[PDB]
């Protein structure tokens, strides 16, 4: 969970 839904 260290990213996000968009690039």
């Amino acid at each position, epitope marked *: *969970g*260290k*990213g*996000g*839904t*968009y*690039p």
Partner: antibody
Amino acid sequence: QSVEESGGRLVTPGTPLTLTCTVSGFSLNSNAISWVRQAPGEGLEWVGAIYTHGSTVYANWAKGRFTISKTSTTIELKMTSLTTEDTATYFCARHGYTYSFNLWGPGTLVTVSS
Amino acid sequence: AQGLTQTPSPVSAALGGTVTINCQSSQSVYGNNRLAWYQQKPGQPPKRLIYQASTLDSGVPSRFSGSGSGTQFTLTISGVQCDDAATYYCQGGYSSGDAWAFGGGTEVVVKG
């Protein structure tokens, strides 16, 4: 879709303070947030991040003076042991899945001064 | 823990000339390509130009190109414009040490 920092103000050295990042149009349940600071005339310095499940990571240099927490709509940065050297703009930034930042606030200014 | 370094400032070119900005990481970035470039002008937030070393972000002029991998990255600007006078920062993602880290930035001066 936006983030916006608030809470920047003039404080004396040793005065604790809390900055707030307010998010719009995306979930903190699926998007990580970093705090990034910038001293006047200086470079971007990653402070730390709060991941989707509430876990936190900090830059080596933070040395426990920075605490990040979140609610559903906001991320707080709590800072302690401020000296004049902590005078800086603080940004919050949304994480992209590319492990880069895809959304920035205008910044808020912490002034540590007599 | 890990250390990022860039081309010293200032990098100068004539309007319409070519600019090279390098970024070196003491540690390989995540998957050898988790390196992003940001542009920043005084008083403004940074704007992402490049992510994953070589992908232009939405609406970024094609005169900007990222390349490299592992520990060595390059941002070039061809036909440099007055609009490109700015500080440029590289940013790595890492599986070990500081998870995110910015280079110190490189200032571009455009000789108009």
